[PDB]
Amino acid sequence: RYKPDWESLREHTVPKWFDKAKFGIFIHWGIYSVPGWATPTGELGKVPMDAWFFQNPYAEWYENSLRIKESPTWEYHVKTYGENFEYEKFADLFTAEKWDPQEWADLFKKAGAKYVIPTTKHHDGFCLWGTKYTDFNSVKRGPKRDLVGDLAKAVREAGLRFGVYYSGGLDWRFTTEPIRYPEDLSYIRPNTYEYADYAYKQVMELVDLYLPDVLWNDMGWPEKGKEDLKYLFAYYYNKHPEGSVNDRWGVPHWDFKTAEYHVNYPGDLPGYKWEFTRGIGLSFGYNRNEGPEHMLSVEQLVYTLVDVVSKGGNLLLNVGPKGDGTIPDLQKERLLGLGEWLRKYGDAIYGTSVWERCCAKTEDGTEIRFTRKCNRIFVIFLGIPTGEKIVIEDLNLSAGTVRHFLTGERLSFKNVGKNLEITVPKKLLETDSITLVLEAV
Amino acid sequence: RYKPDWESLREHTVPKWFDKAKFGIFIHWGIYSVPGWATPTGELGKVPMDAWFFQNPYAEWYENSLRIKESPTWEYHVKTYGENFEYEKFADLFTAEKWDPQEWADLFKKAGAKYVIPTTKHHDGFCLWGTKYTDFNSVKRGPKRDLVGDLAKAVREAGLRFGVYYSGGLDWRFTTEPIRYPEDLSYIRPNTYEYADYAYKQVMELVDLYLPDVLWNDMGWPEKGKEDLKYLFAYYYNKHPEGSVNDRWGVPHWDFKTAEYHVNYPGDLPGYKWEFTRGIGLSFGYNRNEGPEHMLSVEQLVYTLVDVVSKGGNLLLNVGPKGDGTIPDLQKERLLGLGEWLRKYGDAIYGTSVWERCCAKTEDGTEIRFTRKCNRIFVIFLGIPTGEKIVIEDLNLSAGTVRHFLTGERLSFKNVGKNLEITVPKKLLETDSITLVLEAV
Amino acid sequence: RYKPDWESLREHTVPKWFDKAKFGIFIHWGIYSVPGWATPTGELGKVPMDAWFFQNPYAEWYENSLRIKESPTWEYHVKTYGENFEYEKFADLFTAEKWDPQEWADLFKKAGAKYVIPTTKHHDGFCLWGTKYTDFNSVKRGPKRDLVGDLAKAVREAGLRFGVYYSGGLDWRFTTEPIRYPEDLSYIRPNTYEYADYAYKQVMELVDLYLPDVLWNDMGWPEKGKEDLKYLFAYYYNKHPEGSVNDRWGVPHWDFKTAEYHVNYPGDLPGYKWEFTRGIGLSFGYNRNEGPEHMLSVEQLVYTLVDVVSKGGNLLLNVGPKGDGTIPDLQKERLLGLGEWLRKYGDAIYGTSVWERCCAKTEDGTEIRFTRKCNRIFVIFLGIPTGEKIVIEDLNLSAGTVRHFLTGERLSFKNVGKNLEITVPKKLLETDSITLVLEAV
Amino acid sequence: RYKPDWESLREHTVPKWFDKAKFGIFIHWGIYSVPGWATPTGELGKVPMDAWFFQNPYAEWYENSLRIKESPTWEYHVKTYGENFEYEKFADLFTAEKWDPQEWADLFKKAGAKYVIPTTKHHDGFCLWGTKYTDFNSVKRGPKRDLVGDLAKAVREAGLRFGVYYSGGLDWRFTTEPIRYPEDLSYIRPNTYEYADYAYKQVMELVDLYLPDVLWNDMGWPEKGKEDLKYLFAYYYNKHPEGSVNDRWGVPHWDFKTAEYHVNYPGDLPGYKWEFTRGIGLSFGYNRNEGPEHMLSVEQLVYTLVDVVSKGGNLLLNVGPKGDGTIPDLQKERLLGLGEWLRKYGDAIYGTSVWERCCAKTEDGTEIRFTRKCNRIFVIFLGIPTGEKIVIEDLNLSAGTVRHFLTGERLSFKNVGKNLEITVPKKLLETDSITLVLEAV
Ligand SMILES: C[C@@H]1N[C@H](CNC(=O)c2cc3ccccc3o2)[C@@H](O)[C@H](O)[C@@H]1O
Ligand SMILES: C[C@@H]1N[C@H](CNC(=O)c2cc3ccccc3o2)[C@@H](O)[C@H](O)[C@@H]1O
Numbered sequence A, B, C, D: 001r002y003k004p005d006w007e008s009l010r011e012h013t014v015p016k017w018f019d020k021a022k023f024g025i026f027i028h029w030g031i032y033s034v035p036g037w038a039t040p041t042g043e044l045g046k047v048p049m050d051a052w053f054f055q056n057p058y059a060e061w062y063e064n065s066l067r068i069k070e071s072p073t074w075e076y077h078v079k080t081y082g083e084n085f086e087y088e089k090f091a092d093l094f095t096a097e098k099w100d101p102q103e104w105a106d107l108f109k110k111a112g113a114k115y116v117i118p119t120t121k122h123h124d125g126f127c128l129w130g131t132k133y134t135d136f137n138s139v140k141r142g143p144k145r146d147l148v149g150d151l152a153k154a155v156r157e158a159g160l161r162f163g164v165y166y167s168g169g170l171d172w173r174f175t176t177e178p179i180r181y182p183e184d185l186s187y188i189r190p191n192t193y194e195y196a197d198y199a200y201k202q203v204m205e206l207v208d209l210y211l212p213d214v215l216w217n218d219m220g221w222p223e224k225g226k227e228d229l230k231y232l233f234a235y236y237y238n239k240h241p242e243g244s245v246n247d248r249w250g251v252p253h254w255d256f257k258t259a260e261y262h263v264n265y266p267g268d269l270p271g272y273k274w275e276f277t278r279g280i281g282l283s284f285g286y287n288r289n290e291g292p293e294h295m296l297s298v299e300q301l302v303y304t305l306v307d308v309v310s311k312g313g314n315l316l317l318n319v320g321p322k323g324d325g326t327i328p329d330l331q332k333e334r335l336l337g338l339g340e341w342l343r344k345y346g347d348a349i350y351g352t353s354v355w356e357r358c359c360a361k362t363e364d365g366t367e368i369r370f371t372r373k374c375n376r377i378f379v380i381f382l383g384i385p386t387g388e389k390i391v392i393e394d395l396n397l398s399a400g401t402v403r404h405f406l407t408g409e410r411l412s413f414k415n416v417g418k419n420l421e422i423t424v425p426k427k428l429l430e431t432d433s434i435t436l437v438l439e440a441v
């Protein structure tokens, strides 16, 4: 058993399944999906924080944006819905009329994901399961249905792991003033003992009803409730040792860390297990304002996954469904594009470990990443070189044998000084899809 | 912005408006105003604390007195209302049938007050605004009206500042045993986490609905909720930098300190901004038992104001209205008397600063106080000397010019040793109303 | 009395003498003054923190730079003193053979300064007084003299206030590893109970031996010792009420805040008393490598003081003496020039208060700053306009009388729209030294 | 960088070199080695704690035993050294006259160990290095030599990793009363701030002087000093990322856990890196009273290491040298025998990982342990079966190829039900030394 103390809970490390899974699907879905609107300003870490909340690209932040008068959201809202239309009202419009959890699960499985994590409660406080601690939930309003439970059953039937996201650090049902600047986050929070009990009871409830594979908390945990996590974590691990928690609780324990868009993104091997998350575009919740110009292309998604994995991370790619429960076409295509690439190259991703180094590049500027499976080293190019002669800078191999991954064809190579030279027959180079992949042994 | 930490909140000092205002009106009004009864025993600080709670002169302490069997209040109550008449019942009798907030505001403006602060919730827990955290309030019971909101609108329309009083440290809706001795205050308190959240939510609510100019807490703050004040104060000052808080929270921060009747009353310049409070009589809530023998006379009120101001303080004079919302005649006359004196002498009060010393006296025992406005020094006598020859002890001036304030007539003076001599023409002496006032330059 | 708790200590505010003084002299003098060498890289706030400690422009950080091998300092040291010359050895070379405290005091008085603050102990832990808590001090080594005491007597003899600088946060006699990045400061500190007691005892000793007018701590106070400050401050204020402390202790109390070069420099009135500090060049300690190109010119110093004062601050200008006790001519000539402008314009500086706004500018960009003395408003131009017709943007006056400060000559003016037009005869413009100064009433 | 907080420190996990090393040598050497005497009562975990301290088998607890009058130790001491011979006096007899560190290092290398950890300071508080914080150390007394440093140089010269053992929890130089029952440990400890600083300073000094590969604390860390460990660990890891610390500090962080004789010995795979420690006999310090009957035989040592390694642990085997610096032949011959088996079977130990299960057994009870190297699974028999037909209970293989480890000879096998049958020709069985080793692929 795990005891309720940080020294004991440290005994639990990231489970194997999670380390080997490499790719998961995040799902931000709630009543904010109904208006599904945000100004696609840019990526977190690139937009100046003094403007960020006033032109928030996270459509799931709609309510906070609505609370800032004369913010693009306020104007959009007043003209589309009217001023006598409270944000809460969207809970009744959220009907998930076309939702089919098995179709979602089929899709995430085809895309190559091995786990799925929906938002059980985001910052607006709306709950997607029939919780008994609030009536502001999907069973009582809108969908008239236990979205979390139903999705978990479908995901698990498809053979994928199932986790839960819970906004522990923020709940706008307990505050009135919006977040205008990053500094505001230091005092505009529920702040009460009552809220801390609520959060604790809600996560314990999720654990008892669905025994998730991952407890993904966001925005930190209520200061008054931090001590509670020793008990919660021990309770959780003792019922599910292969369970896992992220690092957004603000306490000593975590099984894996996180990075969001540019924030805390590592440039080289970090030394611990971590997970990258971002939307296919610039938002997590659905944004009808985004076009393909704001989204990553299938090629960019593949290069992102490879970069992340060579660095020991897992990619948790977010999908932003519509209020009716359908997944926009732009998103579905990119999920599929990635699933296709993974069907061909998956063996150099799933189940791999990091190598001595994560990165390299060809004399001509083509970026390279490495992954490993025992004695096999995968050399993954972020693109496909034009010429048959490939010069990798600052790299020497002691393998003696280097094959072209898809075909398995042995290739010719030699360490020329501080570099490594390989000849890749154009026929092979033409077989690869987005990345030229080599395997050294 | 202010950050939620004591070191940062210290950056906020008492606002100018408050320091210059000098005189404000306190209003203790609640359901205790209906029975409006107390034994007028004496002034706080003069009555032995071993008898005080058994013969409490604070009529607003009626419920606590009622809970002590065979206390004058219990007997009075049983004979007037009966034993089957719970204190709470007075919430239904509290109808404010004749209340006219604009008339209150007109009156406080004529009296010379620059700010007004009503009890939003006193020790009995009854709330004078439509709070959503309890049904024991003025919108649901008795007046059927938002007394706080309505008074704030009237006060502000009259051009005066508006603050709120909130009994944070005591709420008898959460306790059953009465306070019999001062020691009891150390354990007979709500004491629960629930109460601490309640208090926090109620003051945050007052801030969001009325954005008061002063948060006047009383009886300390729930120990469990003290840390909450860092967030509350930062939240408040960031929405209203000219807002202010008193010193009854029991935490590191405060903008001005307080003194009640004789308690913590300074004898000389204190070194920080402070405010004196007391009732026109011996109680804060209306007491039909007080006669003019228990009240300060207009002259005493003026001398009190001057003493307080020369010492850097503000006077917060309490008015105890009746259950029907009218202000007793004894009180209205004294408010008016003071307003008259302030109309004539206001320029030596509002906007003044303390001088090198607060006090002095004439060879014959007439007390004197000083205030200042740059190079002008006001010399205010607590009374009007009979003889034209005035000898002030232990004072020498380097002004060269001393005028008689009301008329502006230059006077004859000279430093005779360790004293200062001035000749005040009887004609002038007869022009003054309660205080002979001189101005040195 | 002041009590040992933050709520009581809050009662003490910045003493009047300090608020009115406006200009003081900082003195960073120690054994680092002997090598007196640094790479004059740039101003704090403008140099990237990734390079700063490696090319530190603060000569007083010589020891820390010396511990980073292959730092310019390390190279310089090895060629100049040798690889076997430990930093501590500089205490034997620090002889202050040509030191004359009354000569320093007279120069600071002539320079227009009202208070002086020497480094009693900087980060290297060497003490400039005969402390009984360490033998690494100026009585036992180097000068064989109590430098703090002898300087304190001299400064006071000259009629100036005397404060003490103490490095509470860092003491390299308790660490071995150098600071290479800002992050290192979070763990490379003495850290022991022993050190917290040491710092408490030494500041207590400074208070006892010299009862300074200012306790200027630097680098934070040892976490373990933070609660001691309640007792230290009450002890101090009870012995010396007109005493004062800065804001670098990391506890709730402080009497004035500070800004260093660009760091925390206010853009407008801040709302509390503060003080700006910087060296005449880029270092606080004497740097033989700085030349006039690294120093502020007299003109710039004047503009600095004016800007700081119009925003309610005091300027604490640093002088870096040599190991022999002399003050370099470059620094001396700048002090004397500033003193000259102050002898001429002192009245628009000393004893002033902030006005409604600190700033304005002329139609052709000449910056303007304001100060006040009751009804008299001083208009200071940062430079002397060439033409006689002056147009001040966004300013209206309601004084009816504007004079030329130096001569007293009444000048012609009028409010022309959102601007203020004034005519200043070239004969006056020609009398002003570095600043055109106007006086409106 | 690692930051000084538990959440950041969590990022550091057991270094690869340690996980792969599998075997290290502990060395308990001090002035207690001079009397070198204890009652060899039994193994920790098997001796009732009501008797233990009174008949302590740990020779290194001589001083504590000596303070309990009428303890076998007290008797022995009085007859051997005399009632007037204080324990501290043993520091003058501790001369290590025949010590040769390179000879120890070569023996540890030849024994198959990859790291060495000597007691820099045991419970008696005597320090085996020239610490500047106490004169009770080996440079000032006894050997007049820095034993930790000289041993560190030698061990490293031999190519092995060097760690340090430090008694943080107990120091008998700070107590006078002996430990008689486990309960006494809860209050007979140094207990002062002074001691918490002392321990922090000495471990910091060990890190600075020798930058050890392992910080192996014992007996917990002083409560008052626990928060210092955040800073100590970050300081340490930032200087030496491949460094490591054990789990005996009583704080949230640790890189590997420990087990001592029977205490905390895992029965199956535990889920985290750990290390088993015990003496070759019943004592850590040299006990002249132990004979071969109290010691593990070479065979038992082999079986121990194998059991520990198959369960993911490292074995830290203790050697107890004599006061003169020599290692007793009984211990030396066991180290050499183990080294012989490791030179022969090293490949099935060093650099291995745990498999699905650690354990199995043959039809006639021969215990079996497993280790892995990617696809190669090592099958280690704790003993060599007599017959050629072997039946392994509850094991099935899906390798298709099982070889005899020593020769490489392919062997015949098949899954017979829930069992695995294999034929090993006696000529092979006769080549194995203490263990039959098989290799499945
Ligand atoms: C996944 C996204 N999380 C946002 C909040 N982000 C955080 O609390 C935060 C961001 C972040 C980045 C790196 C490491 C830790 C971090 O914590 C949240 O506001 C968005 O709506 C969305 O749910
Ligand atoms: C204004 C009056 N306050 C009474 C409670 N008084 C206090 O908590 C108290 C009294 C007091 C006096 C000096 C400084 C601080 C102080 O705190 C309260 O019991 C009365 O009913 C009335 O509201």
Ligand SMILES: C[C@@H]1N[C@H](CNC(=O)c2cc3ccccc3o2)[C@@H](O)[C@H](O)[C@@H]1O
Binding pocket: C028, C058, C060, C061, C218, C219, C220, C248, C258, C259, C260, C263, C264, C277, C284
């Ligand atoms: C006056 C200088 N102070 C330096 C340390 N600075 C700080 O700790 C710091 C800098 C700073 C700037 C604005 C407000 C607070 C601040 O604290 C110190 O390192 C220099 O050697 C010199 O003594």
Ligand SMILES: C[C@@H]1N[C@H](CNC(=O)c2cc3ccccc3o2)[C@@H](O)[C@H](O)[C@@H]1O
Binding pocket: D028, D058, D060, D061, D218, D219, D220, D248, D258, D259, D260, D263, D264, D277, D284
């Ligand atoms: C290696 C030996 N350690 C003894 C102290 N043991 C402990 O504090 C203890 C024993 C123990 C066993 C498993 C996990 C943690 C544990 O802590 C110590 O008293 C002996 O003298 C010797 O140094």
